[PDB]
Write a protein that binds this ligand. Structure first.
Ligand code: HEM
Ligand code: CYN
Length: 180
């Protein structure tokens, strides 16, 4: 399944609002799961001189297992958009696999304000797009997304009610891992 084509970062976005705190996914819209399991996610993005580093957590709400990654990529000349290669780590950040050259994701920020954000993620391996995801983000677990971000969903051509809301999933987070 092809990642979504009309995706570009919102211009005028202040990078300090996006590379701020930690993010929790409150809603996600996944185009074509080759998996039926539903996930929760939290991550902590930081940027310096155009390089983005982010600690990334996923919790499988069906199996009740968690996995961990560290992404690294460069900002585009376009604005708040980056393609990241990623390490696979354990909960203590010990590296299981280094980043490689075939596995990457491209994250594009479509809205970000003081409390909330809307991003798009296209996950790829080699010549294949593996996932396309929109995620609504907030800075605390189950905080309400802002009006601005709900408007950005509607402006992306989407319906917020068609996203999966993560509150109902019994999410568990590892706030230790996403600290720093
Ligand atoms: C609630 C939000 C999310 C959902 C529902 C979701 C869903 C998934 C699923 C189903 C997988 C495949 C797991 C497997 O079977 O190996 C996956 C992997 C992955 N996701 Fe997400 N994801 C979420 C958030 C994010 C975010 C925010 C990012 C990036 C900042 C991200 C980046 C990745 C990466 C890099 C992998 C590959 C991990 C690997 O190959 O081991 N995901 N995600
Ligand atoms: C995750 N995509």
């Amino acid at each position: 399944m092809d990642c979504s084509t009309n995706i570009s970062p919102k211009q005028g976005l202040d990078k300090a609002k996006y590379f701020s705190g930690k993010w929790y996914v409150t809603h996600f819209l996944d185009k074509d799961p080759q998996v039926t399991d539903q996930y929760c996610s939290s991550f902590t993005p930081r940027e310096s001189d155009g390089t983005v580093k982010e600690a990334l957590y996923h919790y499988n709400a069906n199996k009740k297992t968690s996995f961990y990654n560290i992404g690294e990529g460069k900002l585009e000349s376009s604005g708040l958009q980056y393609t990241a290669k990623y390490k696979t780590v354990d909960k203590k950040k010990a590296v299981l696999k280094e980043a490689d050259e075939k596995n990457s994701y491209t994250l594009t920020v479509l809205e970000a304000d003081d409390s909330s954000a809307l991003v798009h993620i296209c996950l790829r391996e080699g010549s294949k797009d593996l996932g396309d995801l929109y995620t609504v983000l907030t800075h605390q677990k189950d905080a309400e997304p802002s009006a601005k971000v709900k408007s950005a969903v509607t402006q992306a051509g989407l319906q917020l009610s068609q996203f999966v809301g993560t509150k109902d999933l019994g999410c568990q987070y590892d706030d230790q891992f996403t600290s720093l």
